[PDB]
């Protein structure tokens, strides 16, 4: 009971603290996230890395300035994502057509 709920709590808390930090600032300063969360600068960036991967705020941490950026950068889009799978499938079909086609020659 304790293991599961403490994981929910830790994670939740990180999430609350982070939402307020991104929401009015894009290219927000590292000192400002360190300060709100109450961690050291190195520790928040590390944990953030994991969170980005899960995509639980749809931002990016920029190391080359050492700034965090939140923007609208949604993963993929619906037409293209489905189409990508469609173009793949066709490739297998044309191959099959090549085998069948052998018989003519």
């Amino acid at each position: 009971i304790i293991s599961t709920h403490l994981a929910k709590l830790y994670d939740n808390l990180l999430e609350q603290n982070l939402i307020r930090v991104i929401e009015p600032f894009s290219r927000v300063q590292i000192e400002h996230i360190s300060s709100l969360i109450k961690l050291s600068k190195a520790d928040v960036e590390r944990k953030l890395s994991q969170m980005i991967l899960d995509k639980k705020f749809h931002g990016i941490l920029d190391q080359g300035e050492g700034v965090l950026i939140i923007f609208d950068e949604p993963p993929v889009d619906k037409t293209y994502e489905a189409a990508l799978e469609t173009i793949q499938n066709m490739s297998k079909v044309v191959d099959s057509l090549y085998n069948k086609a052998k018989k003519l020659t």
Binding site: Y98, K102, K103, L104, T105
Partner: protein, 476 residues
Amino acid sequence: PAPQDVEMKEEAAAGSGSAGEGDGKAAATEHSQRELDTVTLEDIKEHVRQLEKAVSGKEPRFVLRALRMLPSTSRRLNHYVLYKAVHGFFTSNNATRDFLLPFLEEPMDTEADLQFRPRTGKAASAPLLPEVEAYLQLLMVIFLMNSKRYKEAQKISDDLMQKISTQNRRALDLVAAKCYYYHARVYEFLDKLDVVRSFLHARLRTATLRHDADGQATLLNLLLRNYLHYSLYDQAEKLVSKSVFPEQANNNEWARYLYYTGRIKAIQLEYSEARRTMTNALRKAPQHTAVGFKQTVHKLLIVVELLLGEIPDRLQFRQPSLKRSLMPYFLLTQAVRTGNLAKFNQVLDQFGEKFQTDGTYTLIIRLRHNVIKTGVRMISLSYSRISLADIAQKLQLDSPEDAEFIVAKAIRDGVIEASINHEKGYVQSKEMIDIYSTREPQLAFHQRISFCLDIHNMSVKAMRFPPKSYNKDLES
């Protein structure tokens, strides 16, 4: 006697001939006829008739009993196959294949369309003459290298074959189109410095006005080979450029056209056009019958794709079961990967005897450039900015200058696609990305669709033709 010599060889050819010649004059039935010709006709005649009840046998008994005694060099080639007045390069069977006893057994019986040799002694009373002369000539040419006949017989199917059909109607050219093709596979085999060209060229121009695209196609293939023998690059260069190659001619012949084209172009350093043809070539060939041509094409193919700046797949060499022969070709691919000269140069020499045989050797010398070229493009593409010193060590180049000069030849062509910045001494790649906020993708797609489109109209059109030919044909 042998009843197999007579019944099988005379009947099989009879059905085929009649139906094609008659159908072709009547209507354009061409898709249906082409499908019959390559797969069935060639296989049946070749494989099974060798072991019968007598020695060998393609179909030389339909060129002996529905010969019609034409002015053609069908009869001339026949005499060698049997014995009429000369034994030739192959002996006669006295198991009723005789030309020494003409007017022996016939199962065919009268029918003018069918052909019949004692019904008429000459076909020169009609415009039928060129197509029936072409047809018998066809049967003959395939067999000649097969039964190890040489000397006179090969040369009188190179100049004289040309003489027989040069005055033609659409139907006549269409039968003759085949005749020229089965001549082409023997022709690659023996090289001549002798000039067969004159007749071939003069007949090419007159027939285009007469009608028939198929005849035009085959003569272009024959002709590429003529240049090959002479080993003069210039003359062949003229022929490829001028031609585009239409699509009415069978699938086997297309594969021969692409292989020849691909081979010659690559030497010049036109690896780009040549790769496309060769890849199409492999795929175009038939199944099991094709296998001997297919292996030679598979040797050339790795080399032309390697020349581009690609490093071909290792499984490909492995899979056909000519793996052993393919083994140096794989090693050349590995030498290109590492960028080391030393392995590449030693392999080229050792295996050089085997390469010369394939015909690939001329291309293989050009591949030395690629060994270093592929390595530098791979590294720059992956990681954009790398020092000049770093590329020199990896490939085993002389100098940072030595690398810069590779980049200089390439850039104008676009291969490596990078630039040398001697601001500190690095190579910097052009590359950037975010093409979807620019109009440029609409173009990429636009050409792809235009290209597809002309094919779509063609797809609908061609599709309906063969079932309709079959419905028009009378069936039991």
